[PDB]
Each structure stands twice: as C-alpha cells, then as structure tokens.
C-alpha cells in the first residue's frame, strides 16, 4: 500500500449517518444516543486520477471489511454498489474509475462524482431509512452534498 489511507465517517447535510443494514446495502438515516455504535466507518485513500483544481480522486473502502464502493451501470443506468475487491492487492496507487470518486468541495460541503460517469454523484433520499444510491441530480431534491469527519484508531 504505497499510499496513505484515511479513516473517516460520512454524514449527510441534514445530519444523518450511514449504516450497513445489509451485506451490499447501506442506509442513511438519523442516528443519535448510545445507538451511535450502529454507525459504519469508511477508509478514504488518496489515489491517482484526474488531478484537477478541486477534484481529489480517492477510494472509499470499509475499514473493517474489504468492500469498496463502485459505480456500475444497471441497464445503462448508473448506480451505487459495494463490490468485494482483493483484500490483499487493494488499496493501491491506481484504481478503476469505479472505485475512484472525485471528492469536490463546494459551499463548505463535499460532493463525490463517479469518476466513471461524470455529472452522477452519490445522493441519499431525504426520506427516513432509505438505501443510498447514485443519482444524476445536481442538488434539486436529492441530497448530493455530504460531510466527512476524520477519526482515529
């Protein structure tokens, strides 16, 4: 791993955390009280990619598990999904556009664009208890912004 990983959690702009309600399924909802222990933790890693001025390609891989978020097409329709990669070869300096997310910073908020399908970012449903997914809606009603938080281990 000739790179630098970063342990950090993720929260939406409405104050909600992400939880692994299933193997390859995550859900974003309100979390508070001792029930916070039900919060997942990702591991951001700075990788190589379209190094722009505000674009920072990284890799979000569950710390404990070896699942790496990936943008795949489901009938010509981009979507978000968890794909178990090699727990030995990953992470690394280079990554497939699928595991590469351009971390952008706008209005003091973060926006992850699928290095594979530009214009499509990671969004959540304002609704309560809903699976996370990839949406092609810059703002509007879908919550595409987010908030990362460094942690320790």
Supply the CATH classification number for the domain 1-153.
2.80.10.50
Give the residue from 58, 66, 63 showing the smallest Cα distance to 113.
58
Return the structure tokens found at 125: 């449903």
Tell me which DSSP letter residue 35 carries.
Answer: G
Q: Is 33 helix (H, G, I), strand (E, B) or coil?
A: helix
Q: Determine the Cα–Cα distance for residues 126 and 29; give it in Å rounded to an integer.
A: 9
Q: Is 36 helix (H, G, I), strand (E, B) or coil?
A: helix
Please report, for residues 67, 105, 136, 147, the alpha-carbon distance to residue 23 in angstroms, rounded to integers and kept in the order given.
9, 30, 25, 23
Q: Determine the Cα–Cα distance for residues 63 and 21; give it in Å rounded to an integer.
A: 16
Tell me which DSSP letter residue 19 carries.
Answer: E
Tally the C-alpha atoms within 13 A of residue 61's C-alpha that lie toward its C-beta. 28
How far from chain centre, in Å, is Cα 89? 20
């Amino acid at each position: 791993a000739p790179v630098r990983s970063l342990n950090c959690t993720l929260r939406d702009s409405q104050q909600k955390s992400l939880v692994m309600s299933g193997p390859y399924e995550l859900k974003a909802l309100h979390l508070q009280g001792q029930d916070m222990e039900q919060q997942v933790v990702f591991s951001m890693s700075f990788v190589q990619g379209e190094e722009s001025n505000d674009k920072i390609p990284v890799a979000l891989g569950l710390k404990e598990k070896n699942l790496y978020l990936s943008c795949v097409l489901k009938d010509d329709k981009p979507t978000l999904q968890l794909e178990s990669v090699d727990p030995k070869n990953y992470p690394k300096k280079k990554m497939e556009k699928r595991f590469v997310f351009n971390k952008i910073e706008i209005n003091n908020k973060l926006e992850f664009e699928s290095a594979q399908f530009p214009n499509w970012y990671i969004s959540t449903s304002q609704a309560e208890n809903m699976p996370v997914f990839l949406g092609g809606t810059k703002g509007g009603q879908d919550i595409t912004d987010f908030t990362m938080q460094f942690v320790s281990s």
